[PDB]
Amino acid sequence: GESVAGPNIAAIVGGTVAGIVLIGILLLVIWKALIHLSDLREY
Structure with missing residues (x-):
């Protein structure tokens, strides 16, 4: 009944919400890394 x-x-709401937040942060970090990579890149 409740089991x-x-x-x-x-x-699902809980897991789904968490997953979306996790991806969003993960996506954001990579995006930032790419910009740093372009600038950090000597050459």
């Missing part, structure tokens, strides 16, 4: 991880919605 059936119905809250899978909740965990």
Whole structure:
């Protein structure tokens, strides 16, 4: 009734929200790295 991880919605909401935030930060870091790479790059 409540087991059936119905809250899978909740965990999905929870897991899904967390994953999106994680990707967003991860994407942002790489983007920044590429810019640093272009400037850091001597040559």
